[PDB]
Amino acid sequence: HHSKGEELFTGVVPILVELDGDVNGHKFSVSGEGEGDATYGKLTLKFICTTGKLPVPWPTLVTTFVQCFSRYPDHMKRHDFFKSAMPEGYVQERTIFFKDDGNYKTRAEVKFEGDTLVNRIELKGIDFKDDGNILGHKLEYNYNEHLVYIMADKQKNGTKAIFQVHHNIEDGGVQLADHYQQNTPIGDGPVLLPDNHYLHTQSALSKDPNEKRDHMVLLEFVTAAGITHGMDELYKEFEINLDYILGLIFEHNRGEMIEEVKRLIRSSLGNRAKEGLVVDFIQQTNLDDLPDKASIIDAFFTFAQREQQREAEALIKEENLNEDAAKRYIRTSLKREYATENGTELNETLPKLSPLNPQYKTKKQAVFQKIVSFIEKFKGVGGKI
Amino acid sequence: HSKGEELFTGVVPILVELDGDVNGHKFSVSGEGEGDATYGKLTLKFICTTGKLPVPWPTLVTTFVQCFSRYPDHMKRHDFFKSAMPEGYVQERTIFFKDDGNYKTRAEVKFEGDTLVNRIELKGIDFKDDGNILGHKLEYNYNEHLVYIMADKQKNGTKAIFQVHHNIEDGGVQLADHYQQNTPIGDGPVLLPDNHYLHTQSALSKDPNEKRDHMVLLEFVTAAGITHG
């Protein structure tokens, strides 16, 4: 763990959201509840407008209605400010400029009140136009994905963020919402000050069909990334996580290695299918020989690559694939990181007979299904086949 | 889905020519390299042929070929960029630098023989002399961004709106809001997309043997935002 606050989010945590708002004098209240699971960057929240009709559209309020619930992958966990401020919490303030229209100004405390995470918000909006997209209710009931760019702010001992939301307008076009954001600790305890990075967020809006009131059901996933710049290759979160995990293998000096690989691989996402591969690697190499962090990485990819060839050679015989076609198809799939039933590359692998009757599926299906499984396991390993 | 798609199955060489005028400061830039739409990968080297580049290099990255985007199979229906090929498209932008001037750009993106060519006239006005642009205050670096694409039915093409964050050296951010239009040069049928975006990752560097003012760009562009058939 990087902070004591991090431990409070290892499981499912209940959430309350309370918002009082005022937009061009139209007052309103909103109550919200549900939960979040930071291991999966997941949020489920339901919001009711307790005062009747909401005078602004629901989507414009999503951002304002708990980033302590982002999924920081293991290799970046030292940059999770939001969790490190818990339980005392943090103050989150924002101005939100709707282009060609008014702005919201929001102040919130986000903190544990008991074993619940509470977000209490004051919202003042001004200078909105009556025929505008906000007060005129012209925004689609939907939501785009965004990158939330986060920078440290040493002076306030917390963070800044800047990002631009796209609210799709009904009948076409986009209404932009530039967010400026400040997050300051409530307490005086040690916090984690991040390097520049971002949060990748996805959100989906729905209606509860048994809810007579004005409301929004929200489902949202948030993953942190973008901690590294100047990359020679496409970001692949799971490749970076796997390197990191192997990192922990050099620095665990001196049977308990096999329980920590298992443990970290299992609460991480994306490399679950590589557990057996890494565990084999530990049980089959004198790790005291390999000197540093870069050399155990090279030792595992050389070994993962031998296993890659063995398992390709093995599947090819088990299903009696035409060798050349299979090796082309498999190579392409490894480079592209998925296998496709499209084209004719798959069909070219398929023989007239095979050793095993697929009982319940076609030949194509059986061969496809065994290869997708192989690709999942070895995506990223590299090497020749 | 489109006949233009067939032209992008392999490595395609690229030429980039730009003429630039920012606050009366003129400049030319030549660029070359390749694009593999299979991996969404671009490799490009840019040289200022006129001497010193009078704006920072990062500010020109977006201006310097989204037809090389990796569209996943279930999204190829939405790849306008390739569908307009080989006759190609016009790509127009305004890029608004916050608390500073704007660039306006007009470019033809098209095949010439076996080569994908991007030809750009760029004009910039109202820049501050000790602004982040003319004062060369921007980091030599780049952040990932999403590029939000929308159809434009009337102009038989697409629009895009997105915001680039240029890190100011020694603290803060200079934003750059991009408004973009893409229209086919040809009369042929093209593909009109449902809303989606392009995730764009860029790395900037220097060739150690080039003496001229220059930029090496390694970039990956992947389409996303739709998850069904």
XYZ file of C-alpha atoms in Angstrom, chain B residues 27-226:
200
model
C 8.264 29.404 -42.442
C 8.333 26.228 -44.451
C 8.500 22.660 -43.235
C 9.156 19.423 -45.043
C 8.243 16.033 -43.654
C 8.473 12.409 -44.688
C 8.064 8.863 -43.358
C 5.385 6.164 -43.302
C 2.063 5.006 -41.934
C 0.724 1.533 -41.199
C -3.069 1.700 -40.652
C -2.906 -1.899 -39.508
C -1.192 -0.722 -36.268
C -2.311 2.869 -36.437
C 1.403 3.805 -36.468
C 3.021 6.869 -38.009
C 6.759 7.666 -38.208
C 7.596 11.153 -39.485
C 10.513 13.514 -39.493
C 9.923 17.234 -40.080
C 12.555 19.837 -41.062
C 12.205 23.598 -41.045
C 13.648 24.348 -44.457
C 13.635 28.136 -43.810
C 15.927 28.215 -40.698
C 14.439 28.700 -37.187
C 10.789 27.607 -36.685
C 9.195 30.751 -35.224
C 6.470 28.778 -33.286
C 7.054 25.719 -31.054
C 7.089 22.307 -32.801
C 4.374 20.721 -30.549
C 1.978 23.426 -31.715
C 2.208 21.957 -35.256
C 1.811 18.254 -34.450
C -1.937 18.185 -35.123
C -1.496 20.167 -38.318
C 1.236 17.768 -39.600
C -3.120 12.098 -41.668
C -5.945 10.454 -39.782
C -6.538 8.065 -42.709
C -3.796 6.021 -40.964
C -6.050 5.379 -37.939
C -6.499 1.822 -36.801
C -10.250 1.255 -37.040
C -11.238 -1.994 -35.312
C -13.226 -4.387 -37.481
C -16.674 -3.511 -36.085
C -15.970 0.179 -36.684
C -14.669 0.117 -40.281
C -18.173 1.249 -41.349
C -17.192 4.648 -39.886
C -13.795 5.242 -41.454
C -14.518 8.366 -43.595
C -10.826 9.221 -43.913
C -9.904 6.151 -45.945
C -13.194 6.099 -47.894
C -12.355 9.425 -49.480
C -9.142 7.936 -51.019
C -7.346 8.092 -53.312
C -8.895 11.380 -54.422
C -8.716 12.412 -50.745
C -10.084 15.160 -48.491
C -9.711 18.753 -47.524
C -9.018 19.239 -43.831
C -9.636 22.722 -42.437
C -9.109 23.859 -38.832
C -9.112 26.712 -36.493
C -6.910 26.054 -33.449
C -7.637 28.581 -30.663
C -4.736 29.031 -28.257
C -6.250 30.127 -24.949
C -5.307 33.719 -24.013
C -3.394 34.050 -27.247
C -3.771 33.834 -31.047
C -5.266 31.264 -33.394
C -3.876 29.220 -36.306
C -6.102 28.648 -39.343
C -5.113 25.735 -41.565
C -6.281 24.288 -44.858
C -4.806 21.086 -46.214
C -5.310 18.611 -48.993
C -4.766 14.967 -47.890
C -4.521 12.669 -50.912
C -2.532 10.075 -52.814
C 0.023 11.188 -55.386
C 1.151 8.036 -57.108
C 1.893 5.515 -54.292
C 2.462 8.243 -51.679
C -0.002 9.760 -49.194
C 0.548 13.514 -49.247
C -0.569 16.191 -46.762
C -0.171 19.741 -48.112
C -0.886 22.571 -45.682
C -1.191 26.411 -45.840
C -1.297 27.725 -42.241
C -1.989 31.351 -41.072
C -1.783 32.592 -37.481
C -2.845 36.033 -36.174
C -3.212 37.901 -32.928
C -0.340 36.101 -31.114
C 1.323 37.744 -28.088
C 5.087 38.446 -28.575
C 5.931 37.018 -25.143
C 3.104 34.505 -25.307
C 3.721 30.794 -24.917
C 3.803 30.337 -28.722
C 6.008 33.186 -30.041
C 8.046 33.179 -26.776
C 8.863 29.428 -27.031
C 7.624 28.550 -23.535
C 6.104 25.079 -24.352
C 7.702 21.788 -23.289
C 9.031 19.512 -26.039
C 6.526 16.842 -25.168
C 3.050 15.632 -25.860
C -0.015 14.362 -24.020
C -2.515 11.770 -25.192
C -5.866 13.098 -26.454
C -9.202 11.971 -27.757
C -10.468 13.444 -31.014
C -14.248 13.510 -31.114
C -15.545 12.812 -34.604
C -19.103 13.597 -35.732
C -20.814 13.311 -39.122
C -21.630 16.370 -41.216
C -24.473 15.125 -43.532
C -24.911 18.518 -45.424
C -21.191 18.853 -46.391
C -20.949 15.042 -47.010
C -18.072 14.723 -44.533
C -17.088 15.045 -40.902
C -16.404 17.448 -38.106
C -14.164 17.073 -35.066
C -13.718 19.102 -31.940
C -11.028 18.441 -29.383
C -8.731 20.172 -26.970
C -4.982 19.796 -26.846
C -3.039 20.373 -23.659
C 0.491 21.729 -24.328
C 2.461 21.670 -21.080
C 4.085 25.117 -20.401
C 7.789 24.588 -19.501
C 8.291 25.064 -15.729
C 4.479 25.031 -14.935
C 0.863 24.941 -16.187
C -0.959 24.254 -19.410
C -1.577 26.060 -22.663
C -4.808 24.801 -24.154
C -5.449 24.578 -27.878
C -9.012 24.055 -28.951
C -9.371 22.518 -32.353
C -12.402 22.933 -34.586
C -12.026 20.759 -37.675
C -13.835 20.109 -41.021
C -13.080 17.293 -43.412
C -14.652 17.276 -46.915
C -14.049 14.830 -49.840
C -12.244 16.200 -52.907
C -13.930 13.566 -55.093
C -17.562 13.074 -56.092
C -17.583 9.409 -55.104
C -19.471 7.734 -52.290
C -17.872 8.089 -48.824
C -18.661 6.788 -45.344
C -20.453 8.950 -42.791
C -19.676 7.994 -39.271
C -21.636 7.586 -36.106
C -20.090 9.519 -33.274
C -16.823 7.947 -32.059
C -13.360 9.208 -31.183
C -9.710 8.569 -31.984
C -7.300 7.902 -29.130
C -4.048 9.523 -30.172
C -0.667 8.985 -28.544
C 2.328 10.986 -29.772
C 6.061 11.050 -28.888
C 8.368 13.847 -29.981
C 12.139 13.535 -30.354
C 15.331 14.777 -32.067
C 17.511 13.043 -34.674
C 21.041 13.366 -33.119
C 22.687 13.864 -36.576
C 20.309 16.508 -37.955
C 21.800 19.988 -37.620
C 18.582 21.733 -38.874
C 15.611 22.768 -36.725
C 13.455 19.623 -36.756
C 11.046 17.191 -35.090
C 10.738 13.406 -35.077
C 7.176 12.194 -34.434
C 6.130 8.644 -33.369
C 2.360 8.477 -33.158
C -0.396 5.881 -32.693
C -4.008 6.507 -33.609
C -6.793 4.076 -32.713
C -10.540 4.507 -33.259
C -12.843 3.581 -30.414
C -16.045 4.665 -28.644
C -18.387 2.074 -30.223
